[PDB]
Amino acid sequence: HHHHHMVDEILKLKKEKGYIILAHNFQIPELQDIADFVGDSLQLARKAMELSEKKILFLGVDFMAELVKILNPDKKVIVPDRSATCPMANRLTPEIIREYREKFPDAPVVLYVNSTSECKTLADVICTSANAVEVVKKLDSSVVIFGPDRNLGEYVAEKTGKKVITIPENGHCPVHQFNAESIDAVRKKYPDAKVIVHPECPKPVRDKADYVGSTGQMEKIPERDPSRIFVIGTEIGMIHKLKKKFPDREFVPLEMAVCVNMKKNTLENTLHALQTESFEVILPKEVIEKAKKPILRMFELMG
C-alpha cells in the first residue's frame, strides 16, 4: 500500500517513544486506522480520565486536546496541527458568560466540550451530546445557560422540560446543518432504512429521524437494531467508523458533510508530530486548576 512508509513509521515511533494515539471519529480513515483509541468527545474524555501512558498524541480539535491535557496536566500531549479548532466554540467568550450570569442570577452555566478552556474556567459543568440531558436534569435548577451550540441546547430543553438559554446568538455547527428534505428523499429511496442524526442537527431534521444521538451512541444502534441500511446525519468520518464496526450493513450519508478543521490532520503531519514530538499542548497552571472542576463534575453527574 502506497501510504505504508508513513503508516509504518508512525507505528514504530509511537511504540519507541511511548505514545498512545487518541483520535476523534471525524479524523480521516487513514488516521483512525493508526490510532490506539477512536471515539467521540465523551469517550475521549473518559479515556483521558484513566490514562496511564506518559505521552499522548491527540487527533481532533484543540478544545478536546486541551481537555485531555487538563485531565493529565503532567503528561505530554501533542497535536499535529495547532490550528485545528472548532469555530463554533470560538464565538463564546468570558464576557458573554458573565453578561448572562448577571442577567440570569441562579442559572448554572453548562458548556459543551467544544468551548475554549478559558470559558470552561467559568462553567459550572461541561457536557457532550450524549450526556447533556442527564447532566442538566441532575442540576437543581429549572433554567440553565447553555452554549455554544443552540441546537443541542434546544434539544436539551425538549428532553428536560427545563428552560435553556443559549449563548452566543445563533451558535451552531455548520457541518450538521442538513436540510430535512434529504430525509424525505432517502425515505423514498430506501423505505426500510433507519435514519440516525446528531442532536446538533436542526429541529426539523431531528424530528424526522428514527434516532437522535452522539456518534458514540450511533455506533451502538446497530447492536440492537437489525436494519440492513442506516442513513447517517453527521460528519463524513463517522461512515468509515461505522462500516468498520459493522461490515454487514450499509451506511449512507444523509448528505456529504465535512469538518475542515477535523481534516487538518494528515498522515504526513501526524508523522511529523511523532518525529519532532510537537506541538505540545501547554496551558497556564491556573487554567488547568479551574477548568478541571466543571470537567470532573460532568462525570460526577453521570455516575
Ligand SMILES: O=C(O)c1cccnc1C(=O)O
Ligand atoms: O464528538 C463530538 O462531540 C462532536 C459531535 C458533533 C460535532 N462535532 C463534535 C466535535 O467533537 O467536534
Ligand code: SF4
Ligand atoms: S464538526 Fe462542528 S462542532 Fe465538531 S469541530 Fe467541526 S465545526 Fe466544531
Ligand SMILES: [Cl-]
Ligand atoms: Cl462515559
Ligand SMILES: [Cl-]
Ligand atoms: Cl458526538
